[PDB]
Design a protein around this ligand. Structure first.
Ligand code: F3S
Ligand code: ZN
Ligand code: ZN
Lengths: 176, 85, 66, 254, 58, 90, 121, 98
């Protein structure tokens, strides 16, 4: 009975959102945020081999699809790689954490990809930051996704996508 | 008719099952299966031999006969069935 | 205590180079040229040869009887 | 195709023209790991009065490399029972005695330490040491004392071109890839480039740096246990053995 | 605080009466919404629902 | 080396190899990406403390995933043989 | 749909570190500003090219620029011209023209579509 | 201060063009919140000390040599002035983008 009560009530994924406030207590640390940001920059481009290495860590098998850039060279954008994990009906229009000062235009038209635009499960614009996947951040993209698709989807997304972020930061190079 | 929110609460929890009641049902069924009670679902074709997993799958299916009687503070008692025939 | 047989970073033998390097540096030659012509170009081995203490010379006096 | 750049003592540099990066990386990894080299496995201590404890001395003996070019065929690999034996039995008289690897008597005369200048331990006055080490072939995967190469590098093939004369590029670049002769900027060591892009960063228009897709530069530095060419051959043989065994298991499963 | 507040419980009618029977609140939080399941401090973020429905054509 | 097969199909295969580190997995991933017909091939080290890899192959359906893996092994063997032959003359 | 000859005006340095904005003047008072990266820089200033935006996949060559993305952000400026932004999975192509894409019923909102710009030779 | 997260083999560690692999890898995110610039200064000083072989004095308020001369000498010996260097991924063999 103790084991059953521990499993059905105190499992970690069921308690992702803290009772203190309506926000996720589990989320991207400092390194996950940097990896997600560098993967979600508008300028990133990934070849087929790099995409395969990135997605190897995740437990994802499926059709990659046509690369976002077909000519001159086949390139997969980091947002395209990310969008394979978002649910196919998920809409978000929040600003990113980088739009916290002068560089913010408070609109989805800013040339700086500081405004997260996700439509039908496609990361069309913006970058992931502390305000997108960060821990202790209520009303974030991760918080909305968990609240709308259950803690089991929350755990699945965390594992796979965050391992992908760390792998990309491994293969790009982050130093001081 | 204590308040509108009280009525909303009461009509909401009539047809649903709280996580405490789910945990109690699963623990009771697991304890029963451990002592030697015969499972109702098909034993074979299950990836997990754990008793807890079998009880959880039984609860998800709804085969196990368990009725939860909740006693309201005013004396009203509500019976909720898990059979889901 | 005693110089390691191999460089910690890369498994390159530096123990045999302790005596020549130490003797020539103590003789009055700058360690850079001695290291360069001795055959250690990676600074991982240079820190092995440069930052050594040779405690074993003092310990042989204070040795456990056993 | 494979083209030799420089063949120094215990060093080998090659250019591979048509090989995927995955294969070349597997070659370097197998050179570090999957090439057998004879090294000390167990040590029997009859007597030890040395300042170094038994485990420290055994570790130092294990880290000493032995030449084993002819021992690969005469001794069974660890996956298969034949171990060599090496004796060390000395004693100081009145003054400290630094005993080197040259006084490591071996049962098999062909197997000797790489260099006799390696200092094993220093003995105080009237200190006697006596031990027998049992050498055994092993791969670098089990322990790092079995690795035949001190370092193995696989890097991209550089293509650096000078576009005009620039005086800064000769002093910007850490490598000697640039030279200033007769008031002209030329490339002396094109293959010594590491694609640092400082050369491109300070003088962007004067120099163009690119990487050649098909070619790669593979460098290995041995420790004296094996010839570098033999190290590469043994690494490729180990890869072949693993691939053949995997293919056999896949066929059996089918 | 824990020793003072340990006895409170949520009942089946929405009240927060203690185990000794003393009622503390007729309704918990005035809307019977647990903070864990609320969108931050809001039971329902209406703008979030609007997004969920018409964000693709927003 | 032990071998285990998971979720095997005509176009999709997963296969856990026990006893091989990053080297064999990366070699096989490269050769699988080289052989035509393979839509998506990737290896993974589930835990670095445990020396066991997992290779996931998804094929367009023209050739079987197991056959694609065998072709990749053949390509790797050909490359190794050519490398040996070229080194020996050097 | 919506194909025409055009001349590129300038290649801006761009907001990001490795992003260049290619500005393009087309016919019928149409302008296109699309983002490129250092590798995707097959374009030179004052060159005349031709662009196509079609639901179906068109023919392309290694010397061409081809991509696919989802159209979104239909807006009407206070002036009266319409502004559209097609997202090549992150790479923004910004189209300013009269009688915008969704207004003229050429495309639906959030529809997959290929954008291909090719040099003239 | 910190525990050892994992022990990584020489083959797996990211090697440089000269083949020198790290002995200890430290997360850059530990630096900016703790504001320990002395650690990077000591890293550069140790690299210069190993390369040039000359002694390094880092006594507060008076260091010999200064940072700029150390960087210039590091460039002279054969490495990058800013103590960075080209690193290839050990597992896959691919050069890091930075
Ligand atoms: S060493 Fe070589 S290729 Fe470029 S930046 Fe430095 S020159
Ligand atoms: Zn901005
Ligand atoms: Zn070294």
């Amino acid at each position: 009975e103790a084991i059953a009560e521990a499993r059905e009530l105190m499992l970690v994924h069921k308690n992702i959102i803290t009772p203190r406030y309506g926000g996720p207590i589990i989320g991207g640390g400092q390194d996950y945020i940097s990896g997600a940001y560098l993967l979600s920059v508008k300028t990133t481009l990934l070849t087929v081999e790099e995409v395969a290495t990135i997605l190897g860590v995740t437990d994802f098998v499926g059709e990659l699809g046509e690369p976002a850039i077909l000519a001159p060279k086949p390139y997969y954008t980091g947002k395209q790689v990310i969008s394979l994990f978002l649910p196919k009906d998920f809409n978000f229009h929040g600003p990113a954490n980088i739009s916290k000062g002068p560089r913010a235009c408070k609109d989805e038209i800013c040339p700086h990809d500081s405004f997260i635009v996700i439509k039908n499960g496609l990361l069309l614009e913006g970058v992931f930051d502390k305000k997108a996947i960060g821990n202790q951040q209520p009303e974030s993209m991760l918080h909305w996704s968990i609240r709308e698709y259950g803690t089991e989807y929350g755990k699945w997304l965390m594992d796979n996508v965050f391992k992908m972020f760390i792998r990309f930061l491994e293969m790009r190079g982050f130093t001081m | 008719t204590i308040d509108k929110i009280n009525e909303i609460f009461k009509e909401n929890w009539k047809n649903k099952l709280t996580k405490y009641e789910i945990a109690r049902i699963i623990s009771a069924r697991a304890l029963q299966l451990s002592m030697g009670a015969l499972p109702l679902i098909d034993t074979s074709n299950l990836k997990s031999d754990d008793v807890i997993s079998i009880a959880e799958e039984e609860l998800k299916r709804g085969v196990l006969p368990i009725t939860i009687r909740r006693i309201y503070p005013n004396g009203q008692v509500e019976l909720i069935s898990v059979r889901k025939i | 205590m005693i110089i390691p047989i191999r460089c910690f970073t890369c498994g390159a033998v530096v123990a045999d180079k302790w005596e020549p390097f130490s003797n020539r540096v103590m003789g009055g030659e700058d360690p850079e040229k001695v290291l360069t012509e001795l055959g250690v170009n990676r600074y991982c081995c240079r820190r092995m040869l440069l930052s050594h203490v040779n405690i074993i010379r003092e310990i042989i006096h204070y040795t456990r009887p056993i | 195709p494979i083209s030799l750049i420089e063949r120094n003592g215990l060093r080998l540099r090659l250019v591979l023209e048509n090989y995927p990066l995955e294969f070349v990386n597997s070659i370097r990894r197998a050179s570090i790991l999957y090439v057998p080299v004879m090294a000390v496995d167990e040590v029997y201590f009859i007597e030890n009065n040395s300042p170094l404890y038994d485990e420290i001395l055994a570790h130092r003996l294990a880290l000493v490399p032995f030449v084993s070019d002819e021992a690969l065929e005469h001794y069974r690999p660890p996956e298969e029972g034949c171990y060599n034996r090496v004796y060390l039995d000395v004693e100081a008289k009145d003054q400290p005695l630094m005993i080197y690897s040259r006084d490591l008597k071996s049962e098999d005369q062909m197997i000797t330490p790489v260099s006799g200048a390696i200092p094993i331990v220093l003995l105080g006055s009237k200190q006697k040491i006596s031990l027998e080490a049992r050498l055994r072939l092993g791969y670098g995967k089990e322990h790092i004392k079995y690795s035949p190469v001190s370092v193995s590098i696989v890097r991209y093939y550089p293509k650096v071109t000078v576009l005009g004369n620039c005086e800064k590029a000769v002093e910007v670049c850490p490598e000697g890839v640039f030279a200033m002769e007769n008031n002209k900027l030329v490339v002396k060591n094109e293959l010594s480039c590491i694609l640092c892009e400082e050369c491109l960063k300070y003088c962007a228009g004067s120099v163009s740096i690119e990487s050649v897709e098909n070619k790669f530069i593979l460098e290995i530095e041995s420790v004296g246990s094996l010839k570098p060419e033999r190290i590469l051959i043994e690494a490729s043989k180990s890869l072949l053995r693993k691939l053949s065994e995997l293919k056999s298991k896949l066929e059996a499963g089918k | 605080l824990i020793n003072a507040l340990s006895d409170l419980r949520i009942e089946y009618d929405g009240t927060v009466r203690s185990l000794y029977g003393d009622i503390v609140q007729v309704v918990y939080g005035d809307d019977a919404v647990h903070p864990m399941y609320s969108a931050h401090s809001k039971s329902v973020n209406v703008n979030r629902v609007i997004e969920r429905v018409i964000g693709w054509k927003r | 080396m032990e071998i285990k097969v998971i979720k095997e199909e005509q176009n999709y295969l997963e296969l856990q190899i026990d006893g091989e580190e990053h080297t064999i997995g990366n070699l096989l991933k490269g050769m699988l990406l080289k052989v035509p017909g393979v839509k998506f091939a990737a290896y993974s080290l589930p835990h670095p403390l445990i020396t066991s890899i997992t290779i996931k192959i998804l094929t367009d359906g023209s050739i079987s995933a197991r056959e694609a893996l065998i072709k990749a092994i053949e390509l790797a063997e050909n490359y190794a043989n050519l490398f040996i032959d070229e080194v020996k003359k050097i | 749909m919506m194909q025409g000859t055009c001349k590129i005006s300038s290649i801006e340095k761009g907001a990001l570190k490795n992003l260049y904005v290619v500005k393009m003047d087309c016919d019928n008072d149409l302008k296109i500003e699309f983002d490129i990266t250092k590798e995707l820089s097959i374009f030179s200033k004052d060159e005349e090219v031709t662009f196509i935006i079609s639901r179906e996949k068109p023919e392309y060559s290694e010397k061409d620029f081809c991509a696919h993305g989802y159209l979104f952000l239909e807006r009407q400026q206070e002036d009266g011209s319409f502004i559209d932004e097609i997202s090549l999975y992150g790479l923004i192509v910004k189209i300013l023209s009269k009688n915008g894409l969704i207004n003229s019923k050429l495309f639906k909102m959030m529809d997959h579509v290929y954008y291909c710009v090719k040099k003239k030779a | 201060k910190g525990v050892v997260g994992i022990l990584i083999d020489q083959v797996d560690m990211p090697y440089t063009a000269k083949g020198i692999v790290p002995d200890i890898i430290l997360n850059p995110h530990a630096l900016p919140s703790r504001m320990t610039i002395g650690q990077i200064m000591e890293a550069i000083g140790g690299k210069y000390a190993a390369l040039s072989g000359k002694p390094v004095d880092a006594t507060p308020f008076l260091e010999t040599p200064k940072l700029q001369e150390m960087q210039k000498e590091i460039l002279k010996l054969g490495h990058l002035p800013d103590s960075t260097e080209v690193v290839y991924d050990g597992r896959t063999g691919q050069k890091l983008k930075s």
